[PDB]
Amino acid sequence: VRGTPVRQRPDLGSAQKGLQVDLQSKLVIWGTDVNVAACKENFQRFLQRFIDPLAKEEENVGIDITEPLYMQRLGEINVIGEPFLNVNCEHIKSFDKNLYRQLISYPQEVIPTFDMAVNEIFFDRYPDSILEHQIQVRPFNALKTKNMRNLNPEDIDQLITISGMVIRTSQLIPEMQEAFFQCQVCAHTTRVEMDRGRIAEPSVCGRCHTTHSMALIHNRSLFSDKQMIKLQESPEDMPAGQTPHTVILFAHNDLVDKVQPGDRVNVTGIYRAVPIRVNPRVSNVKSVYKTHIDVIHYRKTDAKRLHGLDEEAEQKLFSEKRVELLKELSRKPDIYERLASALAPSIYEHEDIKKGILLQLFGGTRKDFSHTGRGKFRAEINILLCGDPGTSKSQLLQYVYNLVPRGQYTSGKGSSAVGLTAYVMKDPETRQLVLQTGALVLSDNGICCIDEFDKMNESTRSVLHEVMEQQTLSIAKAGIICQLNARTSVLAAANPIESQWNPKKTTIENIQLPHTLLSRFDLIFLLLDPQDEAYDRRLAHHLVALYYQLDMAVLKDYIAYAHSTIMPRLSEEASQALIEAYVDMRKIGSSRGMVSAYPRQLESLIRLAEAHAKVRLSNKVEAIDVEEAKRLHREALKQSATDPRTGIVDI
Amino acid sequence: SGFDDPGIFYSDSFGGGQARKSQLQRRFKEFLRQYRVGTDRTGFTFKYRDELKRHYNLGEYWIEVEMEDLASFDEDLADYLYKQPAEHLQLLEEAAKEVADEVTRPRPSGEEVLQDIQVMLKSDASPSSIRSLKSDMMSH
Amino acid sequence: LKDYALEKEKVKKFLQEFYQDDELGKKQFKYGNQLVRLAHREQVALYVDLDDVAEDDPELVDSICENARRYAKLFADAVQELLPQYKEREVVNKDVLDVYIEHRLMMEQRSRDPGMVRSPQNQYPAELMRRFELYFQGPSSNKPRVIREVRADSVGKLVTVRGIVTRVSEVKPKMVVATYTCDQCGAETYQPIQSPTFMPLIMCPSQECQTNRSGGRLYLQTRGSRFIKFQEMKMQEHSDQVPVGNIPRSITVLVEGENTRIAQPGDHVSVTGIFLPILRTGFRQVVQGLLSETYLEAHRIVKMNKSEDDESGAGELTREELRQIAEEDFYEKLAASIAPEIYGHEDVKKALLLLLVGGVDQSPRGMKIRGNINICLMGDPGVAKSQLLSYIDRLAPRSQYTTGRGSSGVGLTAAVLRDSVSGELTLEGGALVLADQGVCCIDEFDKMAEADRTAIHEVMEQQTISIAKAGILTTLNARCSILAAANPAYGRYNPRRSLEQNIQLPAALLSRFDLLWLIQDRPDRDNDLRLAQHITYVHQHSRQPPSQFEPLDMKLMRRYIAMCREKQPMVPESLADYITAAYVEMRREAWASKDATYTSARTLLAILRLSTALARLRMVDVVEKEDVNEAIRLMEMSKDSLL
Ligand SMILES: Nc1ncnc2c1ncn2[C@@H]1O[C@H](COP(=O)(O)OP(=O)(O)OP(=O)(O)O)[C@@H](O)[C@H]1O
Ligand SMILES: Nc1ncnc2c1ncn2[C@@H]1O[C@H](COP(=O)(O)OP(=O)(O)OP(=O)(O)O)[C@@H](O)[C@H]1O
Ligand SMILES: [Mg+2]
Ligand SMILES: [Mg+2]
Ligand SMILES: [Zn+2]
Ligand SMILES: [Zn+2]
Structure with missing residues (x-):
């Protein structure tokens, strides 16, 4: 302590009695097995000398041999102003297993001890540092609770980690922390802090001794931020017949507005049980309590996903060694093919679909057309997979769904128009009507996978027009009028009319989608079945070999680096290549029953070329990028196998 | 299920300038248990402990407390009794009930319920005039 | 009327000296052992069988069954008083509630004053410091x-x-x-x-x-x-x-x-x-x-009676079940035991047994292939499709039966519905969720709503249900195998039209089904007479005619199938070429013909999961060539009726 303010922690709840009990007729807290002194000293021992002996990557500061991992973090807290220490509970588990057991079991008593220990260590050195408040420790990565339905009343008030997707976040709620009073008579003022969740009103002023003359003045009081979050849990254990679960989270002061709807997050917090009133206007409570998490920490990183937008925007996400390795990869002649092949490794030789999906994961160049009157340009790549069944479209959509952050999966008739855009429900915790987003807004900066695109009625497929053209969702409903953001990539899979490609019908007759809607997709991959025996044999071997027996982290970091730093711009010779390509492709597609080209396919080419240049870490779009855009656009739609009169045959 | 109601239960108060009345009552209990009269030559006896024992076993349920004994053992308690007799005599009598309980324990059946003890009190101070009972002496 | 101190002594006496020879004939104190176990906090629930109480005090059982809440309290009192004298060590404090109990007990001892009588309210409520819970098992x-x-x-x-x-x-x-x-x-x-x-x-x-x-x-x-x-x-x-x-x-x-x-x-x-x-x-x-x-x-x-539990943990059984499972005709005996009242359909019953056993789910590098077998019985009127489906519903542990449109819409999928304990909106599943890891028997599959057919698409392949409607935005989780029953396009197979023109299923849905079985009943004197004799015997005696092997009871079938279920076999490399050749040959003859259904990689996966199921029925840990042979043969017999 340096006289630095020790701000209260609403995430730990209201303080308890904190009675000290001696177990001899040593001085544990009543009902616990922790004494504050030994817990504090254990944690200091942990902070001073803990080294991860197995982890060397993604530190960017961590010397990871230097005796503290965490006092390096304290040094960072000195360099930056933020007074928060995120302690990985697995580290505590390694160092002191009993301390870990105590932490997850009595967090409300152990975490404040951790706070005192951290501030003692920090202000031992850095004794002239200035912090807007003392350091607050945030333990994360506790032993993951796989299914939150498995939690018992034995687990109430313990520290748990869960994962799921943020569904709704409330508006910020002001929570009182210190009340302000004035006497209506003498104008003498006093302040009263929250004590166990209530304020004791002064009831006599100490100046003019008038009974009940001090009045609470709300806007001179001190408040804290609170936010309710609906999180749809993503359990790793899914017992038979169990429906999906929504858990209430409450974030406080600084974790408020830290996650947006559609974000996948690991949340560490305290499992709380709270009483329900029988009416809002009485004080009787039910015998059966309801539960929520008081959020302690948000972890956005996931090993199996790509980096989220919050991570990619973080300046120190890569070490210099990592950036050099990524750039060295970008100099490889076939980095495009390597990265494409790293996608869906269990799917057999759909190399062009995988290249298109890679370009979709990279995306085109975000542009600010705001001074041009034009509007907003869609930098997202929309792919449609049309092909006869059994050709692994749903597997590709499932792979992309399970790989990106901010993704959604929709199939067929299970979605409606208002279920994709937005609707009003009544929050059953506030008794208030709140607006909930649908699938197309929850993937606002991600990929929406629409499966069985064709088996999906035109009512809900009209919603896609504005999303795919203008990246916005204008809703003019009864009272609420706004323009939701829907900057999604669309990965759609559909069957032909008659559910199987028949060769007697032209491509347009056989896809059978409105011809204005097909122009919104910038790749239409025709996943057709050649009646080919060699391919049968090779696929059969892949599939059977699948019944007995490039990295991801590098792919993840490569894509994150490309999104962070690379903003490809068209070169003059790329400009000319695009002009010629559009004119040629428009000549080609003007044939009988082929998918025609509109001025929108020129922008499709631009997006694909920019994405491909971004794969090279190029920062400059060149003729090779436009050439690959043309080639990908032609290979999808099988325009080499298409005659200008009729359908296609086989490759 | 919505028919019965059990009681409200509580525990002993395990854990935890102007002393609270519980503490004053405890000091009164200590005074009654531990106020010793006599000398090691003639022996020591605990005056009020065995007086409570004798009176209770006879069925008396009262004791006589000298205010100088209390003043010597605990001068603050005697000051409380003089200034605010009403509440501190309630404390002292409750203390006497407890001490009598723990010196007659156990009691023959029929005498199972513990009795209230009246604490009469005396002093050696010279009496004041009945004419001196002015208004400043009210509630003392 | 009665004295509960004496009743407490009675129940104490029962708990302390009741014995049975359950432990392999060794005489154990049935409830004293449990008093030990729950004095050391190794057990929470004590199920007091009232049949045991009735062996020596039927009047007590009558009193229990007549008040049953006084006596649950009495039994809890009695066991709570008996626990200290059954405690042979010190509890390890596995819990957080245990710490509160220990601190409260220690404080009570510390300020004891044993002879001082404390107020009735100055005590710990019994329920606060129990940690066990006592239940009755009704008298038979x-x-x-x-x-x-x-x-x-x-x-x-x-x-x-x-x-x-x-x-x-x-x-x-x-x-x-x-x-x-x-x-x-x-x-x-x-x-x-x-x-x-x-x-x-x-x-x-x-x-x-x-x-x-x-x-x-x-x-x-x-x-x-x-x-x-x-x-x-x-x-x-x-x-x-x-x-x-x-x-x-x-x-x-x-x-x-x-x-x-x-x-x-x-x-x-x-x-x-x-x-x-x-x-x-x-x-x-x-x-x-x-x-x-x-x-x-x-x-x-x-x-x-369909969701029996204890047999699962009691997989150990008599030497008999060892000898039948070891037998070579076990697969035939299990298949014949499926709906013995229905005559014929031997291969259909073999396929149904494969659907019950199922194949093995694969999870290679994040690309899930489901081991479920889905079967569609595409048959003529009155060929016992509904009877087989109803039987399979009565047999399988987690099975829902659905006819045309009574269970349509949210009757298959989920819906949001209000609860009572919290008054919020809970999600309730329909037939596909109530059968999450079992069978959903869809009768009249062809007369099903198009929205539900689309939902069935996504269930059958991805084994989820994606809902993005107004009140609901979830991915339900539906790992079920679909047993469907349907009629051909015009209610009866028409040999003058093409096979897919009769099936009236699109290629995508037709490929969702690992085995699609055509059941035609062409008349013929001998077979019709035999069918009539079987049916008339069933009517006469309420049983199928006796045969060489007695059909297994539905309990035994469930136990045999469940014992098969945890037997994941692996396809060896030595079969890779054989399986690939069989698939290629099947694929070639599919387009060589002009009367063949859609065939794809799903046909290979069907061979592969059917052969895995057949290997599983033999309790082997690798698939052999006879399993692949039986899978191939069932796949041809599915369309054999066309000849
Ligand atoms: N080229 C391939 N590579 C890997 N797996 C394949 C391939 N082709 C087919 N499969 C396998 O066959 C099955 C195809 O089902 P999937 O749902 O992926 O196809 P689909 O195109 O969605 O079919 P539908 O058009 O009927 O929806 C999957 O289990 C997949 O693993
Ligand atoms: N092979 C058979 N063995 C025994 N009983 C049979 C057989 N075929 C039909 N039946 C009897 O005929 C009756 C009708 O059977 P069911 O209702 O199952 O026909 P279905 O296949 O459902 O026809 P539909 O396609 O019209 O629904 C049943 O009571 C059944 O007992
Ligand atoms: Mg699909
Ligand atoms: Mg029927
Ligand atoms: Zn005042
Ligand atoms: Zn109190």
Whole structure:
């Protein structure tokens, strides 16, 4: 302590009695097995000398041999102003297993001890540092609770980690922390802090001794931020017949507005049980309590996903060694093919679909057309997979769904128009009507996978027009009028009319989608079945070999680096290549029953070329990028196998 | 299920300038248990402990407390009794009930319920005039 | 009328010296051993079988079954008094509640004053410091009652009912004793909760705060309080015990403690418990009087008769079942035991057994292939498709049966519905969720709504249900195998039209089915006479005609199938070429012909999971070539009727 303010922690709840009990007729807290002194000293021992002996990557500061991992973090807290220490509970588990057991079991008593220990260590050195408040420790990565339905009343008030997707976040709620009073008579003022969740009103002023003359003045009081979050849990254990679960989270002061709807997050917090009133206007409570998490920490990183937008925007996400390795990869002649092949490794030789999906994961160049009157340009790549069944479209959509952050999966008739855009429900915790987003807004900066695109009625497929053209969702409903953001990539899979490609019908007759809607997709991959025996044999071997027996982290970091730093711009010779390509492709597609080209396919080419240049870490779009855009656009739609009169045959 | 109601239960108060009345009552209990009269030559006896024992076993349920004994053992308690007799005599009598309980324990059946003890009190101070009972002496 | 001190001595005597030869003939004290186990906190639930009590005190069993809540309390008192003398070591304090119990006990000892008589309120409530929970197992001499007929004359009595579970809440904490601390004293205050609601206390009653006449406001806290796992289910009358023109009646079962998480919706269960009232005060009651709701306070919940449980953990059995499983014709015997009253359809029954056993789910580098076999019986009128489906429903552990459009829409998928314990919007699953890891029998598949056919697409391949409608935005989880029954395009197979023009399924849905079986009944004198003799014997004797092998009881079939289920076999490399060649040959003959269904990689995957199921039925850990041969042969027999 340096006289630095020790701000209260609403995430730990209201303080308890904190009675000290001696177990001899040593001085544990009543009902616990922790004494504050030994817990504090254990944690200091942990902070001073803990080294991860197995982890060397993604530190960017961590010397990871230097005796503290965490006092390096304290040094960072000195360099930056933020007074928060995120302690990985697995580290505590390694160092002191009993301390870990105590932490997850009595967090409300152990975490404040951790706070005192951290501030003692920090202000031992850095004794002239200035912090807007003392350091607050945030333990994360506790032993993951796989299914939150498995939690018992034995687990109430313990520290748990869960994962799921943020569904709704409330508006910020002001929570009182210190009340302000004035006497209506003498104008003498006093302040009263929250004590166990209530304020004791002064009831006599100490100046003019008038009974009940001090009045609470709300806007001179001190408040804290609170936010309710609906999180749809993503359990790793899914017992038979169990429906999906929504858990209430409450974030406080600084974790408020830290996650947006559609974000996948690991949340560490305290499992709380709270009483329900029988009416809002009485004080009787039910015998059966309801539960929520008081959020302690948000972890956005996931090993199996790509980096989220919050991570990619973080300046120190890569070490210099990592950036050099990524750039060295970008100099490889076939980095495009390597990265494409790293996608869906269990799917057999759909190399062009995988290249298109890679370009979709990279995306085109975000542009600010705001001074041009034009509007907003869609930098997202929309792919449609049309092909006869059994050709692994749903597997590709499932792979992309399970790989990106901010993704959604929709199939067929299970979605409606208002279920994709937005609707009003009544929050059953506030008794208030709140607006909930649908699938197309929850993937606002991600990929929406629409499966069985064709088996999906035109009512809900009209919603896609504005999303795919203008990246916005204008809703003019009864009272609420706004323009939701829907900057999604669309990965759609559909069957032909008659559910199987028949060769007697032209491509347009056989896809059978409105011809204005097909122009919104910038790749239409025709996943057709050649009646080919060699391919049968090779696929059969892949599939059977699948019944007995490039990295991801590098792919993840490569894509994150490309999104962070690379903003490809068209070169003059790329400009000319695009002009010629559009004119040629428009000549080609003007044939009988082929998918025609509109001025929108020129922008499709631009997006694909920019994405491909971004794969090279190029920062400059060149003729090779436009050439690959043309080639990908032609290979999808099988325009080499298409005659200008009729359908296609086989490759 | 919505028919019965059990009681409200509580525990002993395990854990935890102007002393609270519980503490004053405890000091009164200590005074009654531990106020010793006599000398090691003639022996020591605990005056009020065995007086409570004798009176209770006879069925008396009262004791006589000298205010100088209390003043010597605990001068603050005697000051409380003089200034605010009403509440501190309630404390002292409750203390006497407890001490009598723990010196007659156990009691023959029929005498199972513990009795209230009246604490009469005396002093050696010279009496004041009945004419001196002015208004400043009210509630003392 | 009766003296409960003597009853407590009676139940103590029962608990201490009742013995049985259960342990392999060795004579054990059945309940003393458990008193040991739950004195060391290694057990929570003590199920007091009332058949054991009846062996030596049937009058006690009568008293128990007549009050049943006095006696649950008596038994808890008696066991709580017996626990200290059965404790042979010191509990390791596995829990957090245990620490509170230990601290409270130690403080009580510390300030004991053994001879001083403390107030009746100055004590720990019994329920606060138990950690065990005691339940009755109904006497078998009590015949189970019907939910409709459990009425006011059985309030307070122990009854046993059976029905389908329709609805179970989530497990959530029910306050049993609310603990408070004071801001002045340091004593704890306890408020045992009996009602469904309670008013939290405001002022503390402890001795110190009464002596001091202090404010002493008390604060309700979850940390010292007692919660119990609570769960509310709705259970429904079985169909064959409803009056004639009626609908089935429900009963609310309040499940708490260790009986939670047993029943799931869709389960057939037998519940033993006390029929009890809830005062129902508060309303603008039309009628004067103390009217109340009712519920069954569950004591024993037993899944049964299709969702039997204990056999699963009792896989060890007689030497017999060893010898039949070892036999080579075991697969034929299990197939023949499927609906023995239906004559013929031997290969159909073999395929159905494969659907029951299922293949092995693969999870290679994040690209899931499901081991479920989906079968469609595309047949003529009156060829026993519905009878086979209804049988498979009665057989499989988690099976839902769906006809045309009674269970359409959210009757297959989920819906959001209001609850009662929390009053919010819970998600309830339909047939595809109630059959999440079992079979969903879709009768009249061809006359199904197009929205439901689309949902079935996504279920059959991705094994989920994606809903993005207004109230609901979830991906449900539906790992079921679809047994469908349908008629050809015009209700009867027309040999003058093409095979797919008769099936009337699109290529995508037709490929969703691992085995699609055509069942035509061409008349012929011999086979029709044999079918008629079988059917007329079944009518005459209510049984199938005797054959060489007696068909297995449906319990044995369930146990054999379940014992097969945990037998994941691997396809070896030595079969890779054989399987690939079979698939290629099948694929080539599919387009060589002009009367063939759509064929794809799913055809390979069907071979592969069918052969895995066949390997699993032989309890082997690798697939052999005979399994692949049988898979191929079933795949041809599926369309053999065309010839
Ligand atoms: N080229 C391939 N690579 C890997 N797996 C394949 C390939 N082709 C087919 N499969 C396998 O066959 C199955 C195809 O089902 P999937 O749902 O992926 O196809 P689909 O195109 O969605 O079919 P539909 O058009 O009927 O929806 C999957 O299990 C997949 O693993
Ligand atoms: N092979 C058979 N063995 C025994 N009984 C049979 C057989 N075929 C038909 N039946 C009898 O015929 C009756 C009708 O059978 P069911 O209702 O199952 O026909 P279905 O296949 O459902 O026809 P639909 O396609 O019209 O629904 C049943 O009572 C059944 O007992
Ligand atoms: Mg699909
Ligand atoms: Mg039928
Ligand atoms: Zn004043
Ligand atoms: Zn108190």
